[PDB]
Each structure stands twice: as C-alpha cells, then as structure tokens.
C-alpha cells in the first residue's frame, strides 16, 4: 500500500515490491503494479523506477491523458494489439505509426494537432511490398481459385497475404503510364503434390496471370485490422498558426483498415491553391478497407485517394468541402520506373462534395469495377464527376453548378454509364461523354448550354429542359475521335423557350444518319427541332420514328370526297436545300374507319405550311389525303408524328 | 455519510462504498455540484476519480444527471432506469449512451419533453454588403459589423420566400453555414463558407446574417425513452428528443414509446424526434411505438438530414418534413437535402412518409409503408423523388401528391392493394417511371406528365385513370409509353375522365402491352360529344391472329385476324381501328399500292369469336397477285 | 489484499465489511457476500463463508475469468455485457440471453472444440407450449386479433406466435409448409367476452377459423448484440478444429450481428456438409447481420428460415461456402412445419467461389430483395430464385459455371433491374422456367444472354454471346410459353451470336413474341436463329427495329411513277422450316407534291449474293406509285 501525489515522487521510490498496491494522484493518476521484468517504457502505461518498472493496471482501452508526452504515445502504438482513446489535445512532433490489430479512438474533444514547424504525415499504417518473388509454376487464368508454385519456393501461410504481379498492362482504362497488373490475395488453403504447391485464395484472380508475362508472386508485409474511430486531425484556426501537414492518414499494404467519422482539416490555407500529394486519406495497395462518415475541410489534394491494387474499397457518407477531388482513384507515374496496380471493386455511396477545385469525384485512367451511388457534387470548378477509366457506373448521382460539365469522361475514355443521374445548372453540359461514347439512361440535365454532349452510344429515357443551345449535342471532343451509332429513344426534350432538341455538329464530322430517334417527346420545337452547323452540303437526317412534335392539330377524322380531302393540322416539314438543315416531313399515320366499295390506297400529299407574317399560324397548315380510287368516300383517321 | 464529514484534508485518500460508489479527491477549487462526480463537503468538494465515461449509477438523483449534462464535453452511460422530473439538456461535444438495461422514464407528474438539444438564434443580424447568388462560396459584410470565427456558424436569412413547394404560409428563406475562411479588405469582410448558398441572397430582399449559438457534436447511442406498460401507469411525454440549432446531432438505434395510448387519437406536436434548424444530423435505426404525432419531424432550415433504417408503428407519420405557421408572424426555413432510406412504417394514422408544402431536394429510397389510414407516401412539396419505395394496403393512395403540388417522381416504386390508387398525381402532374400498381380501383391517377414502363394488374376500374383532383386544375400532355397494362379480368387499360374536362388528344400511347382488352381498352365517362382519341403507336391489343401472310387474287385478299375497331358515335367512346402493318414478300409486275379495308367483326351470340374477325387487303393494281405479310397493332 | 486466487479464495475469515484487492492476472477489487450467488470464477467466486463479487461499472472482460465454463455461466443470465479480450477455448455451447452484448477486441476469439464438432453461440427462445384459437377471422392487414376473454394473457411488449393450416404462399412450397408469424403486443382490451390484442405490425396472411387459426405465447430471446464475433481462426484445419453451426438463433428478436469473421466448419475447398451454416436465423424478427466475413463454410453463410421477418444482411463477404445467403424451406417428411421468411433484404454483399448458388432462396419466402450484391466464380448460379417474384436491383454475376441469374422448376417471374452478368458460362439470365422480367439488364460472355419463356426483356445491352443474345425457350416442353415483349434492347452483332433464338424443339411459337425498337445492327439476314421447326413458323411482330447502320435513309426522285433505290433493304422470302419469311419496313414520306402524286409502295427487293462475302451496298428496292406519272421526291427509311 503506497500512495503518491505526483509522478516524480512515485518514480523515485526505490523500495517497490511486486506485492505492493501502488496509487498515483493527478491528471494521469491510476493504480500500478511493480515488476522486475524488462518492460517497454512509454511514460503512460509503463514507467521506469529503481529496481524495475511500474505497469499501469487496466482493462479495456488506454487513454492519452495517461501519457506524459507525444513521444510516449508513439512508443505505445509502435506495438501491435493496442487500443488507445485520444481524450486530450495531442501535439504531434512526428508521424504516429499504427500496427496490426489496433484501434485508435477519439473522444469528442480528443485531437491530434500537427506540427507547425514541419509539414509531415500524421497517421501512417505502413506495410510493404515483397522483396523477392517466385514464378508461378503454371499460367493462372482470370477466375482461378488456386495458384501454383514449385514446392518449397514460397512459404504459404494460411490467413496471410500474397502479392501477385506480371508484366501485363492494367486494363481498366487507357492506362497511359503503362502501369502493370498486381493483386493482393489471402491464403486460405494449401496442398502439395508432385512437386507443386497449390495455394487456394480467398478471392479469385481478375486477370490472366501468364508465364509469358513473367507472372510471379511474393509475400508482402501487411498491416491488418486497424480501426480509426472519429479521427480529428488539426482544428479550425490552424491557418493563423501556420499549422499544416502533408497526408493525414497514409496507408500502404493495409488490410481491413476501417476509418469511421472524424474530421480532417487544413493541409492548405482556406480556398488556396492545390498542393500536390497532400491528400487527407491515402489508400495504396489496401484491401477490404473503408472510409465511412469522415468530413474533410481545406485539403490541398484529394479527400480520399485510392491507388495501387487497392481492392474492395468503399467510401460512404463523406462530406468534403474545399478540396481538389473529394474521391480520386489514381494512376501511378512510371517516369522513374515500372509501377504495378489499379484499383479493383470500388464503391462510393452517399458522398457529398462542395467547392472542389477540380472534379468532385474522380478517377484517373486505370481502375476496374468502379461505382458511384447517390453521390452529389456542388459548385465544382471543373466537372462534378470525371471518369478517366472505362465503364465507370453512376447510379442516382447528382451534379449542381459545375463550372464545366456535371458528369464527364475525358480523352480516350470509353462508355461511362449513367443511370437516373441528375444534372442542374452546370455551365457547359449535364453529361459530356463525347470522348468515346456513353450510355445515358433515364438521366436529366437542366440549366446547361447543352444537356448531353455525346459522340455515340445511347440516350434512353430521361428529361431535358432549360438548355440554351440544345438538349442533346451530337459532337466529339476532337474531330479525330470516331463517331459511333447513337440511339435517342423515349427522351423528353420539349421546347420550353430555350434551345433546340438536337444539335448535329457537322464541324467535327458528325453524320446524322448514325443517329436514330424514336418515340421522343419533342413537343413545341416546330420547324426548329434540330440545330446544324458546319455542313458543306445538306446532310441526310437521322432515322426518325413516331416522335411527338406538336400537341394540337395532331389527330382527327377526314371524309374523302371523290378520292380526296384537305385536312387542317399541325403537319410540318422542310423542303429546302440549305446546308445546315434537314429535308424532312411529318409521318402521318392513316387508318380507314368506313369501308365503301370505292376504298383505294391512301397517301399524304400537298403539305402546305402557313407563312402568315409576322406570326405564322400552324393551325392553318394542311395536307391532302388522296386515294388511288377517284370515287373513294372513306372516313380516314389521321395522326401526326415526327 | 461522506458529505457530512467534518475534516477532509487534500492529502486524505477517499472511498465511497455502495456498489455504485468509487475513489475521490478532496479540493477547495470551486466545482459544480452534481452529487455524482462532484459533491460539496465542509471546506470544499470531493471529485470522483475516473477516466472515460461517467455512469448514471454514480448519481444520487435525476437532478444531478441534469446538472452534469448541463455542461459541454460530457460522456454519460445510462446504466440504470432513470426517473425524469425535468428536461435533460445535452450540450456540445457530448455523448449519451444507453446500456441494454438503461432507460429514461418520463415524468409521471407532468407531461413534458424528455431530451432537449438547444442552440439559439442570433441576437443580432447584420446586412449583407453585396448580393450573394445561389452557389456563392463567400458572403460579405461591412468590416467590423460582426466577428466571424473560423469553425463557428452563421445564420443567413432574407425576405425571399422558400421555393421548394407551394409554401402557403409564406415561410421565408434561411440557411446555417460554417465559417471556414475570413479576410478583410477595403472596409468589407469576406467570409468563406463550408457549403455554398442554395438561394439568391439579395440586398433587395434585406438579406442578413447573424451568429447563432449552435449545439454541435452530440451523439445519442440507443436512447430508450419510456417502456411498454407506460399506459397502465398513465406515463406519457410531449416531444421525446427535441433539437433546435444543432449541428452534427447523431441518433443511433434506441426505442421511443408511448406519448399517446396505444391506437389512440393523435396529439398535435407530440413528435418522438424533432429536428428544427439542424444541420448534418441523422437518425439511424431507431424504433418508434405509439406516438401521438410524427416519428421524425424535420423543419426550419434543417439541411443534410438523413433518416435510415427506422421502424415506426402506430404513429401519425413515420417521417414528416414540416412547414411553420406564420399566423403570429414571420417564420424562416425549409428543409434542404433530406434522405429517408430503408425505413418502415406500419399502421400510421395519416401518411406513412410525408412532407408539407416546403422543402427542397427530398428523397425517399427503399422505404415501405403498410396499412396506412391515409396514403403510404404524401408529397406536398414539389419534385419529391421516390426510389424503389413500396406501399401496401393504404386506405387511400399508395403514393400521392396533393392540391397544388407539382410533379413527384416515382422510380421503380411498387404499390399493392391500396384501396383507391397506386399512384395519385392528379393534382399537378407526375413522372411515373417503371412503377407497378396492383390491386386498386385505378393503378395511376394522373392529369399530365409521363407513365413510362412498368406493370399494372388487378385494378378494378382501369390501370391508368386520366383525371384531375378538381376540374379547375390544368390538364397537360401525358405520355403513356412501354407500359404493361394487360387485361386480367379486371378493369380497362385507360379511363379518360370527361367529367373534369379531359381531352384525350393530350394523351399519347406508344408501345404499350394492352393485350386482352379487345374493344374495351378504354373507359370514358362524362363526355357529351364523342372525343377524338389519343395518338396511338404500335401498341399490342391481341396475342393471337395478329401476324400472317395473305396472297392477293385480282388485287384483293380477305384475311381472318384479330383486327378490331369501333365505328359508332356514342359520346363515351372512341372511333378507332387497328394499325395493320403491311409488307410485300413477292414482287410481281402487277404490284400496286396496298391498303386495308372492309374491317368486319364477328358477333357470335354468347361470346364473339375475334378469330373470325376479318379485313381486306386491296391493291391499287387490279391484277396484283403479291404475297403480303400483315401485322396487327393498336 | 491478496495476490493470486488460491490465495484470495482460500482466505478463511472474510466478512461483509472487508476491502479486498487481487493483484496481478484477473485483478481488481471485490466484496464478500453470504447470499447464494452463481459462481462463474470471474465476477463471482465461492469462498469460505460465502462468495466474492467483483466490483465494476461498464462491461465485464473475459480476462477476468478462470475458464470457458465460467464465461458460459456468466452469459447464461440476461442483462450481460461481456468483452472478449482473450482467446477462449470452447468445450460447450455458449448461450446468450436477452438484453445482452458480447463484444470482441481484435485479438479476442472463440476457438471451437477440436474433439467434438458442436454449435458455438446459441440465442434460443422457444415455441409456445399451448395455443388458443382465434375468436374471429383476421384478414391480411389486420392490426388486431381476438381471442375469447381469459383464453390467453397477452402482455404489452411481449410476443405472440400465430399459425394456421393455410399453406405458405411466397413460392411453389413443395413441402407444404404452413403459415406462421411472430408479432409484438402493443395494446390489449377486453369487452363482451372477447379480448382484442393490438399488434406492432399487421398480419400478412388471412388467418381463418376454417384454417384452424390459433395463437400462442413464444419465449423470445430479445435485444442481443454481437459485436465483431471471431469464431475459429486460420490454420484450424491443421488442428482438425471445426464446428457445426457458428451462431444459431431461434425465436430471437432484435438480434444484431456486426462485423466479425467466422471460419472453418469444413476443410478449405472441401465438400459441403449438410446443416453447417455459419449463421442461422430461425423464427427471428427484426434481426440483422452487417459486415461479417465468412471463410470455408460447409453450408450457408447466412441461413434464414421459419417465419423470420424483417431480416437484413448487409455488407458481408463470403468465400468458399455453399451459398452466401440462403432463405430456406423446412422438410415436412417427419411432420408439419410452419413459417416462411417475410421481408428480407440483402444489400452490398459479396460472394466468391460458392459451391452452389451465390445468393439463394428455396421455394417459400415473401418480399425478398437483393440490392447491389455480387457473385464471383460460382460453381452453379450466381443468384438462384426458387420462390416467386424475387427482386434484384443492380446485382452483378461474374463467371458462374451455369447461369449468372436463374429461377428454377415451377418458379414465377423473378424481377431483374439493371443487373449485370459477365462471362457466366451458360447464360446471363435464365428465367425459362416460369417467366421473367428483365429490365435494363446486361449480359456479356455467355452462350445466350437471356433464356426466357415469357415475360419482358425491356432495355439493356447484350454482347459477346456465342449462340444468341436472347434465347426463347423453356426448361421442359410442358412449361407454358406466355407472351414475350422484347423492346428497346441493344443486341447488336459483334462477331458472335445472333440476336434471338427461337426454340422450336420445345414448342416455341414465335408469334407470341413482339420485338419493338431494338438495336439489332449488324446481324443482316442472320438476326434470328431457329431450330426444331418442321414447318416454317410465322414470325414475331416486329416494329421499328434497327438492323443496318449504312444505306438506311435517303431521298429518291420518282420518274414515271418509279425509283430504284440502292439501300441495305433486307429480307428472306424462302420456305426453309428453320427460318422466317420477312422483309424490311421501309417508311416512305413524300417531300415534293406534284399533281401526279399517287399512293406509294415498296416492291422489287433485290439482294446481292456475292460469294463468299455478299455486298449489301448493292442491295436495292423499288418505290412504285399508283400514279404512272408520279415524279415525287420520297424520303425512305429502312427498319426491321
């Protein structure tokens, strides 16, 4: 039974015995056990004394308020299997490394303030790539459950990881840097027969790993099962104290790293220029890792940066304000040598971005199986969403007030897919997939120069309004890009006092006959449903089927007399030869409703359009129904389409 | 008795027993007594020594718990059954967490609120120095007009009216923002905000800004308010958890029960959870039973609010975004950016999921309403979006708008056995995309907009009902495209309501599946003169006798087929006939232009046989011997 | 004070007033008591004269306990919160009771007994011991049920279990499982000899007196939270260390399982073992599994059966299991069974290398939905529906050995919305058993993109399918063909299969199919495949499809009432049984209006037949007028 009023008194005491009950009072107080066994001093949980060590007695988490200084915190977390609650405002003077099976948790008022003297990383979760590789014993196709190596070449330990690579190029996107393939897999079974060890993986392979590509495998060092609960890195007012950092949380070769909530603020001054590499959270070669609920303010580079062969990565519920990209999947520069890995299986869901300096949500030109679900970007300085890898899918995303395009692909990028996405008041376009096609399904764009820019693919369903030039702009990024077939079907693209329905860009080589337009609502555009520019000669129109161009004077019944009737109706057409125009006429569907013996074959002719000045009256447009039988007196139903 | 003890000295080492007691320190420094972590004793105070959370079991009384929570930076674990006699206020950077056994029983002597999380409105406003349009990252005020501290909040308002919906009360705009940057130059202070402005804030509307005192960063973990059996004890409350001017309030799981008797009448204002002027706040997983008013009420300028995974049973609305009555003076704020996801409602006394007539960017995703006494879902603000929601057995409509409300959007929503209709957007248009309605009087009631895709069955009157709430509402164009609305022994495909002035020519019907309806694909009532029909393009009406090949003899062939039409003049009917598509398959020199005539329909005496209906293909060339493929559409 | 526990518990003269401390392992403060206590050797110890109780606030810790037996004893009561901060070696089932939480630190584990395969965690209520008849019919949607006054005592906040002889109606129900539901009492009143019991949730079947509808009081285990359960560990198979069921729940309410890892009740990649599911929910309500990972499981990852209602499975990863998720039937071979799942959500789940279907139901269950789930490398299907009207939203199947998505014998109309199927061997979607609704889906890399006997294929996109994109067929010839709408589908030629294959062998009538506004570009004369017809069948109705991309719109000027137009007009006019007779729809619109304007028609369709490669830029048709003087300019558009 030994009681001490302060730390210095306790640690100077020379008479401790192992059977003693020991108590410290004050801000780091607690109960202690004396031992002679060599213990790792950290001045919070272990203290040196004459004759041995004092060990704080506790179950559950450790608390930062137990520690004398930052140095001790770093020492404590240098070991695995730690649970530390940050319940004080810590002043960092070095990087804090976190090891396997560890949790760092913050209370409402816990903080790590970075060092104002030197910009450095705050939290590191750092594994490493293999130092040596062995060849696969045989090719392993995509979908393989097992890989094989020569017996004894590699220690395969169940529950640990392997890192596979080859010279095959990443294939998710254009991959302009020529990044090579890699994947991280967990060993779940092992068997050896005939000199070959067969290693069963948790997940199957997503590329063909071939010996002709020097397919090989090594053992990485992973940091696994790290939880960061409510990390609070820096604090508002940081810019008045010149207090910054580089990367907030940097992970490399981590597995099951889960980041929940928290706030990461201020590795640049508010509203200031971007700073290369200064991402808030960076996942490099991480597997089964997540960021859920974290908020980001005033970040020099990306909110969450995902690169290398990061696989089964998810970002949910983040709010990112004044950052370069809220989320960016990244490439790796091969300027200085080979690099390996693209992200595979990425989900961003229910995330919000405000005032990004570049695209709200971004990929670079590699990555596979990338999905964004119910994300929203507001007031981007560039695009709301930018896809640079192929076939990125967007489900129910929204972009508001982007300086350029709500959603866009980019040079050489193939067919992003937009489903029920909504674009409002983006300056240039709602959707810009004019670089290499797009699939635009049930989307809406309102308040742009053009609702969609597209060179080929499909615009199916959806609704477009308040677009000053046209609702759909068939164009290219550059003239060299190939136009492909474009279907526009079931789209509501009515006239609302603004632009035309569809703009064909002759300037860059658009052939309108590669477009087909079926069952669209183009009501109100009259003779001005199309905009054309840059044509040297009048081009042939798209195929057009059962579109709606007018809402009045569009169905009725006529009675022939002597084989003919004149019908007043909003029939329409252009019969001129002006180069930037189409020659076209309404499709008038005729059906016979009485059946005299003089019934003949019916046709539409004599289309006249009222050109009263200054205001034309389309209700005095007319056409003639003529029968091949000059005695025809049939009643004929008529319907006017485009 | 520890507190009555005469002679404590600072050095003295201290222990309170009693299984919920502990270790203590003496001090003379002034401390706030709560009889749980701090006690007055002659000469000074005893402070409990602990790290991590406090526990309710440490406190002698509810009043001590209240005093403890009256300060910010508190973490309290409720590990006992607490008997409230006053409101528990929670302040910033605080957590209230309940164990499996912890509970707050409401005050039995006074029905009152249980939890309050209450910030305050600004005490003074200053005008904006310049117009700030929607999308503005910065606002300006005269230098020295107020002190804007980075990390703190601003409350902006003007006389511009909220614009999310009809706004019949004339609620004015407001928003709450966080200061992230401040610069002063040339007598103007420019304040950079976390999030951009969502309205124009104009000097002409007396745009102004003040500093609210927010309660920020509160977490309520598994709140258990009241318990089953409460009604036998006559133990109720008014509002369970009331928050105003809060930021980052997060409520997780828990159960809130019983501010009315089970199945009893509603009580105005008795919401389980109320969010007024709250930002970045959420309710996830909570369960609600026997609530007099709304499960989660959301009002004022609440922005970026989410409700996930709740279950609400015997409540007025599970979720309701609200208006504010301006009868006694101006009010400010509509909700902006609201998500309800994966929520369930049972036996609501009014709509399952609701808005009033203001609110912007409101979305409901995979929510479900069962057995509502009114609608499953009610939109009273404009452009509410519903994704994959479901309504079962509502007493009126599965999904509905209301008077004056524009264009709800329904995407892949499903309506089953709702008495009146699946979807009722007859008040001001609707967009009904790939939806389904089964088991109603009418699948969809709609005055204008779009019904695209989807599938309709078991509707006794008709699948689609083109009508209005009142004859004075405008009919607008209606597209009906790609809809499956087959005959299944019940109603017709489309009902045109002449009584309220519906002009069928404003309707267009393309590529729908109307198989089986025969001559009775349309219902019409209230027409005094036969109306002109909708445009119709390549719909399916029959599945048999609908494609073949005919050979002309002397320019003619008679073809048996399920061709159909009505040629009469009855006011409540359409004159129409099949679209028969003809294509030539052989190419004699006598090939002429082709036409359909002599449509005849069988009228056998018990049941007509449409396989014996016929038409004639006639050529303009009297010697034509062409083979002609024919296909029958509506 | 003491220092080890033989030492503390040997002490012969404890009295109630003593202040006691154990130093070292499992250390803390204690007090003495003479009241009968449940010895657990962690929080309660027997001592000369009575018992020592550990003093603490908040959770207990497994590090406090001398052995597994004590852990089991502690958790045998309700209202327990235990943190597993050690590696526990199980030798018996751990039962968990109401209002309890079992939480694991990253290193905490339960290692199963290597000597005997048994269950690890049990959360076990019980069915009623007695039932009483309903006093009146209670239709679906009822809020209240009635019983004779005094027949049963219904306590607010407790539960009821309702059943009748009516058969479960979610699917084919080949075992004849009967209906049941679990409901919570929220109100009770009695009048005129009848007790009316108000329920939390409404009834989802008609409960009729003619079906012997009855109700009893089950004993539920309620409010159990399992935080990060870690069951078994990698390398278990080297120690022959297995189990049967990992977490088995029956008659539980508000059981919530968060994260954790369950591994190894079979050897890696070994044969399935009947019944050895990782998690099993039987007759559970308002219960969830979120985040859990599963490896090397003999049966199902999550098994859901009985009248489990309002069950959700989110965010799981399952690798080397029979099914990741399976809703189950109950065999009635030895007697009557009751209950089908009602209201089930699977969201954001991932399956790899399942030995059978990735995500599964058997032939009962109502209101089943899978959202954003993904199956990789299934040895059977990615997704299998055996109950009626299972809905799939934005789900993905990759490289299944059979079908990406499939129904099965006697199963009606699964619904696929925006689902994606890649490189599944046989098909992307196989709903050829009983119809399907295939909406905006994609299938790439299969023998056939979709196999279907009736229903709708609407929208979507199909590529790289070796036989055809759509296969109109049946499982067996006895299955009914119903109408099939194919509309708005992109099913272009890309060097692989045809657009649509009509299976005459099983009696497919092509006229029951309608094809409108599809993109069939590139297929030329080979847009259909037919087999097993003995007589040329009549084709589907076709409306405004795209078959060619070049030579498909122009303007012709008639001369003497005719113009020859070179265009990619197409048709087949032969009689070969496995072929259709058909021709392009050429839409004609007059652009000039001479007095000699007559009615227009297409004739003389001529198609180049150069060997080995035909040149369709040499195909032609003639526009002919009824007026031999017609000189009209005529717009022409070529469709299928």
Structure description:
Chain C: Its EC number is 4.-.-.-. Chain C: The record marks 461 as: Important for the adsorption and infectivity of phage. Chain C: It comes from Klebsiella phage NTUH-K2044-K1-1 (Bacteriophage NTUH-K2044-K1-1). Chain C: Functions as a receptor binding protein (RBP) and mediates the attachment to the host capsular exopolysaccharides. Displays a lyase activity that specifically degrades the K1-type polysaccharides of Klebsiella pneumoniae capsule. Chain A is mostly beta strands. Chain A contains two helices and 61 strands. In chain A, a hairpin with a 2-residue loop joins β16 and β17 (196-201). The first copy, chain A, is elongated, with a radius of gyration of 34 Å. Chains A and C meet through β53, β57 and β59 of A and β53, β57 and β60 of C.
Greatest chain-chain contact: A-C, 69 and 75 residues
**Distance separating the two termini of chain A:** 97 Å
What structural category characterises the helix and strand content of chain A? mainly beta
Q: Fraction of residues of chain A in helices?
A: under 10%
Cα Rg of chain A: 34 Å
For the record, the CATH class of the largest domain in chain A is Mainly Beta
Number of domains of chain A: 5
Could you tell me the number of beta strands of chain A? 61
Percent strand of chain A equals 35-45%
CATH topology of the largest domain in chain A: Pectate Lyase C-like
- Give the overall silhouette of chain A: elongated
| Oligomer state of the chains in this structure | homotrimer
In the CATH hierarchy, what is the architecture of the largest domain in chain A at level 2? 3 Solenoid
Number of continuous helical runs of chain A: 2
Sheet with the most strands of chain A?
16 strands, parallel
User: What topology, given as strand order, has the largest sheet of chain A?
Assistant: 6-7-10-19-22-25-28-31-34-37-40-43-46-49-51-53
PDB class: viral protein
Keywords: beta-helix, polysaccharide lyase, tail spike protein, viral protein
Assembly: trimeric
Entry title: Crystal structure of Klebsiella pneumoniae K1 capsule-specific polysaccharide lyase in a P1 crystal form
């Amino acid at each position: 039974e030994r009681v001490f009023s302060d730390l210095a008194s306790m640690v100077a005491y020379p008479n401790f015995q192992v059977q003693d009950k020991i108590t410290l009072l004050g801000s780091a107080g607690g109960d202690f056990t004396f031992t002679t066994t060599a213990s790792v001093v950290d001045n919070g949980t272990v203290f040196a004394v004459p004759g041995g060590y004092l060990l704080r007695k506790f179950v559950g988490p450790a608390y930062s308020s137990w520690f004398s200084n930052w140095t001790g915190i770093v020492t404590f977390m240098s070991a695995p299997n730690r649970h530390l609650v940050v319940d004080t405002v810590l002043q960092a003077t070095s990087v804090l490394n976190i090891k396997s099976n560890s949790t760092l948790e913050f209370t409402d008022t816990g903080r790590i303030l970075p060092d104002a003297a030197v910009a450095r990383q705050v939290l590191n979760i750092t594994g490493s790539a293999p130092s040596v590789f062995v060849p696969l014993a045989a090719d392993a196709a995509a979908g393989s459950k097992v890989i094989t190596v020569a017996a004894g070449a590699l220690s395969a330990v169940k529950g640990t990881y392997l890192y596979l690579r080859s010279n095959k190029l990443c294939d998710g996107g254009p991959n302009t840097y020529g990044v090579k393939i890699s994947q991280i897999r967990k060993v779940v079974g092992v068997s050896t027969s005939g000199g070959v060890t067969s290693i069963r993986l948790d997940k199957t392979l997503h590329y063909n790993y071939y010996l002709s590509d020097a397919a090989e495998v090594g053992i990485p060092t992973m940091v696994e099962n790290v939880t960061l609960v409510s990390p609070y890195i820096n604090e508002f007012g940081y810019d008045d104290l010149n207090r910054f950092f580089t990367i907030g949380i940097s992970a490399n070769f981590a597995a099951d790293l889960h980041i929940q909530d928290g706030v990461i603020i201020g590795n640049k001054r508010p509203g200031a220029s971007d700073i290369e590499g200064r991402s808030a959270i960076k996942f490099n070669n991480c597997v089964d890792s997540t960021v859920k609920g974290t908020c980001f303010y005033n970040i020099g580079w990306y909110g969450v940066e995902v690169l290398g062969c990061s696989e089964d990565t998810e970002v949910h519920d983040i709010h990112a304000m004044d950052v370069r990209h809220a989320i960016s999947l990244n490439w790796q520069s091969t300027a200085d040598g080979d690099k390996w890995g693209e992200p595979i299986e990425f989900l961003g869901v229910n995330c919000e971005a405000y005032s990004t300096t570049q695209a709200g949500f971004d990929t670079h030109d590699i990555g596979k199986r990338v999905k964004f679900v119910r994300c929203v970007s507001y007031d981007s300085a560039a695009a709301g969403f930018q896809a640079r890898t192929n076939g990125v899918e967007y489900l129910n995303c929204r972009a508001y007030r982007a300086a350029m395009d709500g959603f866009a692909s980019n040079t050489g990028v193939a067919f992003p897919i937009y489903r029920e996405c909504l674009a409002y008041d983006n300056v240039r376009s709602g959707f810009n997939c004019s670089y290499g096609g797009g699939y635009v399904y049930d989307c809406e764009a309102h308040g742009s120069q053009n609702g969609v820019r597209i060179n080929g693919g499909r615009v199916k369903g959806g609704r477009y309004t308040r677009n000053s030039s046209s609702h759909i702009f068939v164009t290219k990024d550059v003239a060299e890009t190939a136009q492909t077939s474009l279907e526009i079907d079931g789209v509501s693209m009515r006239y609302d006092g603004t632009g035309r329905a569809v703009y064909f860009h002759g300037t860059v080589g658009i052939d309108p006959t590669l477009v087909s337009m079926s069952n669209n609502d183009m009501t109100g555009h009259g003779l001005f449903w199309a905009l054309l520019s840059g044509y040297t000669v009048q081009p042939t129109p798209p195929r057009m089927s059962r579109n709606l161009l007018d809402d009045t004077g569009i169905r009725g019944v006529a009675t022939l007399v002597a084989g003919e009737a004149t019908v007043n109706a909003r029939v329409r057409g252009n019969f001129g030869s002006v180069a930037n125009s189409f020659k076209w006429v309404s499709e008038v569907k005729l059906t016979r409703l009485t059946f005299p013996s003089s019934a003949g074959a019916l046709t539409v002719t004599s289309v006249a359009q009222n050109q009263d000045v200054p205001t034309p009256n389309p209700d005095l447009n007319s056409f003639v129904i003529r029968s091949s039988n000059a005695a025809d007196v049939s009643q004929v139903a008529w319907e006017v389409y485009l």
